[PDB]
Protein backbone atom coordinates (compact mmCIF):
# COMPACT_ATOMS: atom_id res chain seq x y z
CA UNK A 1 0.00 0.00 0.00
CA UNK A 2 1.09 3.58 -0.61
CA UNK A 3 1.76 5.96 2.26
CA UNK A 4 1.26 9.48 0.87
CA UNK A 5 -1.70 10.38 -1.33
CA UNK A 6 -2.64 13.48 -3.29
CA UNK A 7 -5.90 14.47 -1.62
CA UNK A 8 -7.67 17.39 0.05
CA UNK A 9 -5.77 18.57 3.11
CA UNK A 10 -2.47 16.91 2.23
CA UNK A 11 0.44 19.18 3.13
CA UNK A 12 2.81 19.67 0.20
CA UNK A 13 6.13 21.43 -0.32
CA UNK A 14 6.82 23.65 -3.32
CA UNK A 15 10.03 22.67 -5.09
CA UNK A 16 10.22 25.35 -7.78
CA UNK A 17 9.00 28.84 -8.54
CA UNK A 18 9.06 32.03 -6.49
CA UNK A 19 7.80 30.09 -3.44
CA UNK A 20 10.33 27.26 -3.48
CA UNK A 21 10.82 25.39 -0.20
CA UNK A 22 7.60 26.81 1.24
CA UNK A 23 4.78 24.77 2.73
CA UNK A 24 1.33 24.54 1.16
CA UNK A 25 -1.97 22.72 1.62
CA UNK A 26 -4.12 21.15 -1.09
CA UNK A 27 -7.77 22.20 -0.99
CA UNK A 28 -9.06 21.15 -4.44
CA UNK A 29 -8.05 18.58 -7.05
CA UNK A 30 -8.76 19.89 -10.54
CA UNK A 31 -7.61 16.72 -12.33
CA UNK A 32 -4.81 14.15 -12.31
CA UNK A 33 -2.20 16.80 -13.20
CA UNK A 34 -3.36 19.96 -11.39
CA UNK A 35 -4.18 20.79 -7.78
CA UNK A 36 -5.27 23.97 -6.02
CA UNK A 37 -2.81 24.73 -3.21
CA UNK A 38 -3.80 27.27 -0.57
CA UNK A 39 -0.93 27.05 1.87
CA UNK A 40 -2.29 29.83 4.03
CA UNK A 41 -1.08 33.12 2.58
CA UNK A 42 -1.25 34.64 6.06
CA UNK A 43 1.06 31.94 7.44
CA UNK A 44 3.48 30.62 4.81
CA UNK A 45 2.88 33.27 2.14
CA UNK A 46 1.83 30.93 -0.68
CA UNK A 47 -1.12 32.52 -2.53
CA UNK A 48 -4.16 30.51 -3.51
CA UNK A 49 -3.29 29.24 -6.98
CA UNK A 50 -3.34 26.25 -9.32
CA UNK A 51 -0.09 24.30 -9.61
CA UNK A 52 1.08 21.28 -11.56
CA UNK A 53 1.95 18.13 -9.64
CA UNK A 54 5.45 18.17 -11.16
CA UNK A 55 6.36 21.21 -9.04
CA UNK A 56 5.42 19.95 -5.55
CA UNK A 57 6.27 17.08 -3.23
CA UNK A 58 4.04 15.28 -0.76
CA UNK A 59 4.84 15.42 2.94
CA UNK A 60 3.78 13.01 5.68
CA UNK A 61 1.24 15.41 7.22
CA UNK A 62 -2.46 15.89 6.51
CA UNK A 63 -4.47 18.75 8.00
CA UNK A 64 -7.51 17.23 9.67
CA UNK A 65 -11.07 18.38 8.95
CA UNK A 66 -10.06 20.13 5.72
CA UNK A 67 -12.88 20.00 3.18
CA UNK A 68 -12.65 20.92 -0.48
CA UNK A 69 -12.87 24.62 -1.21
CA UNK A 70 -11.85 25.52 2.33
CA UNK A 71 -11.65 29.28 2.76
CA UNK A 72 -8.59 31.11 4.01
CA UNK A 73 -10.20 32.04 7.33
CA UNK A 74 -11.13 28.47 8.26
CA UNK A 75 -8.01 26.89 6.74
CA UNK A 76 -5.74 29.15 8.80
CA UNK A 77 -7.40 27.95 12.01
CA UNK A 78 -6.84 24.28 11.17
CA UNK A 79 -3.25 24.84 10.03
CA UNK A 80 -2.25 26.15 13.47
CA UNK A 81 -4.43 23.62 15.30
CA UNK A 82 -2.35 20.75 13.92
CA UNK A 83 0.91 22.72 14.32
CA UNK A 84 2.29 21.84 10.91
CA UNK A 85 5.11 24.39 11.20
CA UNK A 86 6.55 22.76 14.32
CA UNK A 87 6.07 19.24 12.96
CA UNK A 88 7.64 20.01 9.58
CA UNK A 89 10.78 21.47 11.15
CA UNK A 90 11.34 18.21 13.06
CA UNK A 91 11.47 16.09 9.88
CA UNK A 92 14.45 15.35 7.65
CA UNK A 93 13.12 17.63 4.90
CA UNK A 94 12.73 20.54 7.30
CA UNK A 95 16.24 20.25 8.70
CA UNK A 96 17.67 20.21 5.18
CA UNK A 97 15.74 23.42 4.43
CA UNK A 98 17.13 25.18 7.50
CA UNK A 99 20.63 23.93 6.69
CA UNK A 100 20.43 25.41 3.19
CA UNK A 101 19.33 28.76 4.64
CA UNK A 102 22.14 28.53 7.21
CA UNK A 103 24.88 27.96 4.62
CA UNK A 104 23.84 30.67 2.15
CA UNK A 105 24.67 33.53 4.56
CA UNK A 106 27.97 31.91 5.50
CA UNK A 107 30.96 33.91 4.32
CA UNK A 108 34.54 33.13 3.29
CA UNK A 109 35.93 33.55 6.81
CA UNK A 110 33.22 31.19 8.05
CA UNK A 111 34.18 28.63 5.41
CA UNK A 112 37.74 28.78 6.71
CA UNK A 113 36.79 28.02 10.31
CA UNK A 114 34.43 25.16 9.50
CA UNK A 115 36.78 23.55 6.97
CA UNK A 116 39.73 23.76 9.37
CA UNK A 117 37.72 22.60 12.39
CA UNK A 118 35.96 19.73 10.61
CA UNK A 119 39.23 18.29 9.32
CA UNK A 120 40.63 18.04 12.85
CA UNK A 121 37.46 16.51 14.29
CA UNK A 122 37.15 13.96 11.48
CA UNK A 123 40.84 13.05 11.76
CA UNK A 124 40.54 12.79 15.55
CA UNK A 125 37.56 10.44 15.29
CA UNK A 126 39.45 8.21 12.86
CA UNK A 127 42.35 7.94 15.33
CA UNK A 128 39.99 6.96 18.15
CA UNK A 129 38.82 3.76 16.45
CA UNK A 130 41.14 0.85 17.24
CA UNK B 1 49.89 26.99 -4.71
CA UNK B 2 46.22 27.97 -4.84
CA UNK B 3 43.37 27.93 -7.35
CA UNK B 4 42.06 31.40 -8.24
CA UNK B 5 40.29 30.49 -11.47
CA UNK B 6 37.47 28.38 -12.89
CA UNK B 7 38.12 25.96 -15.73
CA UNK B 8 36.24 26.80 -18.93
CA UNK B 9 36.08 24.57 -22.01
CA UNK B 10 36.82 26.05 -25.42
CA UNK B 11 33.79 24.59 -27.20
CA UNK B 12 34.27 26.33 -30.54
CA UNK B 13 33.70 29.52 -32.48
CA UNK B 14 30.50 31.46 -32.97
CA UNK B 15 29.19 29.86 -36.12
CA UNK B 16 26.24 28.72 -38.19
CA UNK B 17 25.53 25.37 -39.84
CA UNK B 18 28.00 25.98 -42.69
CA UNK B 19 29.84 29.15 -41.61
CA UNK B 20 32.20 30.05 -38.79
CA UNK B 21 33.40 33.34 -37.29
CA UNK B 22 36.66 32.85 -35.38
CA UNK B 23 36.51 36.30 -33.79
CA UNK B 24 34.13 35.20 -31.02
CA UNK B 25 34.98 32.06 -29.05
CA UNK B 26 32.42 30.03 -27.12
CA UNK B 27 33.27 28.83 -23.62
CA UNK B 28 31.52 26.62 -21.07
CA UNK B 29 32.42 27.75 -17.56
CA UNK B 30 32.39 25.02 -14.93
CA UNK B 31 29.45 25.50 -12.58
CA UNK B 32 27.42 27.82 -14.82
CA UNK B 33 24.39 25.87 -16.06
CA UNK B 34 22.04 28.70 -17.06
CA UNK B 35 22.10 32.20 -18.50
CA UNK B 36 21.06 33.83 -15.22
CA UNK B 37 24.45 32.98 -13.66
CA UNK B 38 26.37 34.57 -16.57
CA UNK B 39 26.06 38.24 -15.44
CA UNK B 40 28.76 37.74 -12.81
CA UNK B 41 31.26 36.62 -15.45
CA UNK B 42 30.50 39.33 -18.03
CA UNK B 43 33.75 41.29 -18.26
CA UNK B 44 36.03 38.94 -16.35
CA UNK B 45 39.42 37.88 -17.70
CA UNK B 46 40.07 34.66 -19.63
CA UNK B 47 43.49 33.22 -20.47
CA UNK B 48 44.47 30.36 -22.78
CA UNK B 49 47.72 29.13 -21.24
CA UNK B 50 49.52 26.62 -23.46
CA UNK B 51 52.87 24.85 -23.31
CA UNK B 52 55.48 24.92 -26.08
CA UNK B 53 58.51 22.62 -26.06
CA UNK B 54 61.22 25.16 -26.89
CA UNK B 55 64.86 24.27 -27.53
CA UNK B 56 67.86 25.11 -25.36
CA UNK B 57 69.03 27.69 -27.91
CA UNK B 58 65.85 29.78 -27.82
CA UNK B 59 64.87 32.43 -25.29
CA UNK B 60 61.18 32.15 -26.19
CA UNK B 61 59.16 31.11 -23.12
CA UNK B 62 58.01 27.53 -22.78
CA UNK B 63 54.69 28.80 -21.37
CA UNK B 64 52.62 31.33 -23.30
CA UNK B 65 49.14 32.78 -22.91
CA UNK B 66 46.40 34.47 -24.93
CA UNK B 67 44.12 36.82 -23.00
CA UNK B 68 40.55 37.89 -23.59
CA UNK B 69 37.32 39.02 -21.98
CA UNK B 70 33.92 37.40 -21.53
CA UNK B 71 31.56 39.79 -23.27
CA UNK B 72 28.03 38.34 -23.53
CA UNK B 73 25.92 35.25 -22.78
CA UNK B 74 25.11 32.73 -25.50
CA UNK B 75 21.93 30.69 -25.25
CA UNK B 76 20.05 29.66 -22.13
CA UNK B 77 22.62 27.08 -20.98
CA UNK B 78 25.27 29.38 -19.53
CA UNK B 79 27.50 29.45 -22.60
CA UNK B 80 29.44 32.68 -23.02
CA UNK B 81 31.20 34.61 -25.77
CA UNK B 82 34.82 35.70 -25.37
CA UNK B 83 36.96 37.94 -27.56
CA UNK B 84 40.72 37.39 -27.44
CA UNK B 85 43.66 39.49 -28.58
CA UNK B 86 44.56 36.71 -31.02
CA UNK B 87 41.84 34.27 -32.05
CA UNK B 88 42.23 30.92 -30.34
CA UNK B 89 43.74 28.19 -32.53
CA UNK B 90 41.12 25.62 -33.55
CA UNK B 91 43.64 22.96 -32.54
CA UNK B 92 42.84 24.12 -28.99
CA UNK B 93 39.20 23.06 -29.29
CA UNK B 94 38.11 21.07 -26.27
CA UNK B 95 41.02 22.27 -24.14
CA UNK B 96 40.72 24.03 -20.78
CA UNK B 97 40.95 27.78 -20.23
CA UNK B 98 41.20 29.92 -17.10
CA UNK B 99 38.43 32.26 -15.96
CA UNK B 100 39.92 34.65 -13.43
CA UNK B 101 38.23 36.53 -10.59
CA UNK B 102 39.28 39.97 -11.90
CA UNK B 103 38.53 42.72 -12.93
CA UNK B 104 36.62 42.44 -9.68
CA UNK B 105 33.34 44.15 -8.91
CA UNK B 106 32.95 42.85 -5.35
Amino acid sequence: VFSRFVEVGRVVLMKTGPFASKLAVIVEILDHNRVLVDGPQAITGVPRQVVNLNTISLTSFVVNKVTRGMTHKKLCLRFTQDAIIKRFNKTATGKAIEKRILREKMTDFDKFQVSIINRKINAAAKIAVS
Amino acid sequence: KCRLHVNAVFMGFQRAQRNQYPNVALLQISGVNTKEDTPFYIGKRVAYVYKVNVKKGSNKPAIRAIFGKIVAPHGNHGVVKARFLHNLPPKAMGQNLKVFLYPSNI
Partner: protein, 204 residues
Protein backbone atom coordinates in the same frame (compact mmCIF):
# COMPACT_ATOMS: atom_id res chain seq x y z
CA UNK C 1 44.47 22.74 -16.37
CA UNK C 2 44.37 19.27 -17.92
CA UNK C 3 41.59 16.70 -17.50
CA UNK C 4 43.56 13.56 -16.67
CA UNK C 5 40.92 11.79 -14.58
CA UNK C 6 38.42 9.48 -16.27
CA UNK C 7 34.64 9.67 -16.02
CA UNK C 8 33.19 6.19 -15.44
CA UNK C 9 29.57 5.69 -16.49
CA UNK C 10 27.61 2.72 -15.17
CA UNK C 11 25.54 1.76 -18.21
CA UNK C 12 23.15 -0.24 -16.03
CA UNK C 13 19.54 0.87 -16.32
CA UNK C 14 20.24 3.41 -19.07
CA UNK C 15 19.12 3.90 -22.68
CA UNK C 16 21.65 3.21 -25.42
CA UNK C 17 20.77 6.19 -27.58
CA UNK C 18 20.42 8.83 -24.88
CA UNK C 19 23.64 7.74 -23.18
CA UNK C 20 25.47 8.05 -26.50
CA UNK C 21 24.19 11.56 -27.23
CA UNK C 22 25.38 12.92 -23.88
CA UNK C 23 28.69 11.05 -24.10
CA UNK C 24 29.28 12.15 -27.69
CA UNK C 25 28.95 15.85 -26.87
CA UNK C 26 31.32 15.64 -23.90
CA UNK C 27 33.88 13.64 -25.87
CA UNK C 28 34.16 16.71 -28.10
CA UNK C 29 34.62 18.82 -24.96
CA UNK C 30 37.92 17.10 -24.16
CA UNK C 31 36.62 14.79 -21.44
CA UNK C 32 37.69 11.16 -21.07
CA UNK C 33 34.96 8.55 -20.73
CA UNK C 34 34.87 4.86 -19.87
CA UNK C 35 31.42 3.27 -20.09
CA UNK C 36 31.38 0.05 -18.09
CA UNK C 37 28.70 -2.65 -18.34
CA UNK C 38 27.97 -1.48 -21.90
CA UNK C 39 25.94 -4.71 -22.21
CA UNK C 40 23.25 -3.77 -19.66
CA UNK C 41 21.89 -0.81 -21.64
CA UNK C 42 18.25 -0.86 -22.70
CA UNK C 43 16.59 -0.19 -26.05
CA UNK C 44 12.95 0.25 -26.97
CA UNK C 45 11.14 -2.74 -28.40
CA UNK C 46 10.76 -6.45 -27.75
CA UNK C 47 13.28 -9.12 -28.70
CA UNK C 48 11.40 -10.07 -31.86
CA UNK C 49 11.03 -6.35 -32.58
CA UNK C 50 14.78 -5.83 -32.18
CA UNK C 51 15.70 -8.89 -34.25
CA UNK C 52 13.76 -7.56 -37.25
CA UNK C 53 15.78 -4.35 -37.01
CA UNK C 54 19.01 -6.34 -36.73
CA UNK C 55 18.31 -8.46 -39.81
CA UNK C 56 17.70 -5.29 -41.82
CA UNK C 57 21.04 -4.01 -40.54
CA UNK C 58 22.71 -7.27 -41.60
CA UNK C 59 21.35 -6.84 -45.13
CA UNK C 60 23.61 -3.87 -45.91
CA UNK C 61 26.74 -5.43 -47.37
CA UNK C 62 28.93 -4.65 -50.38
CA UNK C 63 27.65 -7.02 -53.05
CA UNK C 64 30.90 -7.40 -55.00
CA UNK C 65 33.00 -7.87 -51.85
CA UNK C 66 31.45 -8.52 -48.42
CA UNK C 67 34.87 -8.05 -46.80
CA UNK C 68 34.79 -4.41 -47.89
CA UNK C 69 31.20 -4.05 -46.76
CA UNK C 70 29.67 -2.82 -43.55
CA UNK C 71 30.96 -4.70 -40.51
CA UNK C 72 28.16 -5.77 -38.17
CA UNK C 73 29.68 -6.02 -34.71
CA UNK C 74 27.67 -8.14 -32.28
CA UNK C 75 29.37 -7.44 -28.96
CA UNK C 76 27.25 -4.93 -27.00
CA UNK C 77 30.37 -2.90 -26.22
CA UNK C 78 30.66 -2.49 -29.99
CA UNK C 79 26.95 -1.66 -30.28
CA UNK C 80 27.51 1.31 -27.97
CA UNK C 81 30.67 2.36 -29.81
CA UNK C 82 28.80 2.37 -33.12
CA UNK C 83 26.03 4.50 -31.61
CA UNK C 84 28.54 6.98 -30.18
CA UNK C 85 30.61 7.06 -33.37
CA UNK C 86 27.52 8.09 -35.33
CA UNK C 87 27.11 11.25 -33.25
CA UNK C 88 30.72 12.42 -33.71
CA UNK C 89 32.30 14.34 -36.61
CA UNK C 90 33.35 12.15 -39.52
CA UNK C 91 36.58 12.24 -41.53
CA UNK C 92 38.50 14.83 -39.53
CA UNK C 93 41.05 14.88 -36.73
CA UNK C 94 38.47 16.27 -34.31
CA UNK C 95 36.23 13.24 -34.77
CA UNK C 96 39.00 10.66 -34.41
CA UNK C 97 40.54 12.33 -31.36
CA UNK C 98 37.15 12.42 -29.64
CA UNK C 99 36.52 8.72 -30.22
CA UNK C 100 40.02 7.87 -28.95
CA UNK C 101 38.90 8.83 -25.42
CA UNK C 102 36.07 6.29 -25.21
CA UNK C 103 36.05 2.68 -24.02
CA UNK C 104 33.22 0.20 -23.48
CA UNK C 105 33.50 -2.99 -21.48
CA UNK C 106 30.99 -5.75 -20.86
CA UNK C 107 31.66 -5.65 -17.12
CA UNK C 108 33.96 -3.86 -14.69
CA UNK C 109 37.57 -4.73 -15.55
CA UNK C 110 40.36 -4.55 -13.00
CA UNK C 111 41.26 -0.81 -13.00
CA UNK C 112 37.72 0.56 -13.35
CA UNK C 113 36.02 -1.67 -10.78
CA UNK C 114 37.14 0.58 -7.88
CA UNK C 115 36.31 3.95 -9.44
CA UNK C 116 33.54 6.44 -8.73
CA UNK C 117 30.66 5.60 -11.08
CA UNK C 118 28.47 8.36 -12.51
CA UNK C 119 25.05 8.52 -14.15
CA UNK C 120 23.35 10.54 -16.88
CA UNK C 121 19.90 11.64 -15.64
CA UNK C 122 18.67 12.52 -19.13
CA UNK C 123 19.46 8.97 -20.29
CA UNK C 124 17.90 7.12 -17.35
CA UNK C 125 15.35 4.50 -18.36
CA UNK C 126 12.99 5.42 -15.49
CA UNK C 127 12.47 8.97 -16.80
CA UNK C 128 12.21 8.69 -20.58
CA UNK C 129 10.12 5.50 -20.73
CA UNK C 130 6.56 4.59 -19.94
CA UNK C 131 6.96 1.72 -17.44
CA UNK C 132 4.65 -0.48 -19.52
CA UNK C 133 6.79 -0.07 -22.65
CA UNK C 134 8.76 -3.26 -23.26
CA UNK C 135 12.54 -2.98 -23.49
CA UNK C 136 15.51 -5.21 -24.31
CA UNK C 137 18.89 -5.45 -22.61
CA UNK C 138 21.77 -5.12 -25.05
CA UNK C 139 23.32 -8.26 -23.58
CA UNK C 140 20.20 -10.29 -24.32
CA UNK C 141 20.00 -8.97 -27.88
CA UNK C 142 23.69 -9.71 -28.42
CA UNK C 143 23.24 -13.37 -27.54
CA UNK C 144 20.35 -13.69 -30.00
CA UNK C 145 22.61 -12.50 -32.85
CA UNK C 146 25.76 -14.42 -31.98
CA UNK C 147 27.75 -12.85 -29.15
CA UNK C 148 29.50 -15.84 -27.61
CA UNK C 149 30.80 -14.31 -24.36
CA UNK C 150 27.50 -13.46 -22.67
CA UNK C 151 27.85 -16.18 -20.01
CA UNK C 152 31.52 -15.43 -19.35
CA UNK C 153 30.46 -11.91 -18.36
CA UNK C 154 27.65 -13.25 -16.18
CA UNK C 155 30.26 -15.29 -14.31
CA UNK C 156 32.66 -12.37 -13.89
CA UNK C 157 29.94 -10.01 -12.67
CA UNK C 158 28.76 -12.57 -10.11
CA UNK C 159 32.17 -12.74 -8.43
CA UNK C 160 32.47 -8.94 -8.47
CA UNK C 161 29.09 -8.66 -6.72
CA UNK C 162 30.12 -11.05 -3.95
CA UNK C 163 33.56 -9.45 -3.60
CA UNK C 164 31.94 -6.03 -3.23
CA UNK C 165 29.56 -7.55 -0.68
CA UNK C 166 32.24 -8.31 1.91
CA UNK C 167 34.16 -5.07 1.32
CA UNK C 168 30.99 -3.06 1.89
CA UNK C 169 30.14 -5.03 5.03
CA UNK C 170 33.58 -4.35 6.50
CA UNK C 171 33.41 -0.67 5.51
CA UNK C 172 29.99 -0.28 7.14
CA UNK C 173 31.47 -1.68 10.36
CA UNK C 174 34.38 0.77 10.40
CA UNK C 175 32.19 3.73 9.42
CA UNK C 176 29.78 3.05 12.29
CA UNK C 177 32.67 2.91 14.75
CA UNK C 178 34.14 6.13 13.36
CA UNK C 179 30.71 7.77 13.47
CA UNK C 180 30.23 6.98 17.16
CA UNK C 181 33.76 8.09 18.03
CA UNK C 182 33.04 11.48 16.45
CA UNK C 183 29.92 11.81 18.61
CA UNK C 184 32.04 11.47 21.75
CA UNK C 185 34.43 14.16 20.50
CA UNK C 186 31.45 16.37 19.68
CA UNK C 187 30.02 15.77 23.16
CA UNK C 188 33.44 16.16 24.78
CA UNK C 189 33.99 19.21 26.98
CA UNK C 190 37.53 20.01 25.80
CA UNK C 191 36.23 20.46 22.24
CA UNK C 192 33.46 22.83 23.38
CA UNK C 193 35.04 25.83 21.63
CA UNK C 194 35.25 24.09 18.25
CA UNK C 195 31.81 22.44 18.44
CA UNK C 196 29.89 25.71 18.86
CA UNK C 197 31.29 27.06 15.58
CA UNK C 198 30.03 23.97 13.76
CA UNK C 199 26.65 24.21 15.49
CA UNK C 200 26.42 27.91 14.62
CA UNK C 201 26.56 27.12 10.89
CA UNK C 202 24.60 23.88 11.21
CA UNK C 203 27.48 21.51 10.47
CA UNK C 204 27.15 19.89 13.90
Amino acid sequence: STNNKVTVIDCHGHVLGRVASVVAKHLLLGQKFVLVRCEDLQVCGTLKMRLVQWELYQRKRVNTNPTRGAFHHRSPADMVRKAVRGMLPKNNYRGKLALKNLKCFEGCPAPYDKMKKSSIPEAAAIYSFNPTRKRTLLGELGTAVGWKYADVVAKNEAERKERAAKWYAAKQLKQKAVAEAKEKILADEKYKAKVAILKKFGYA
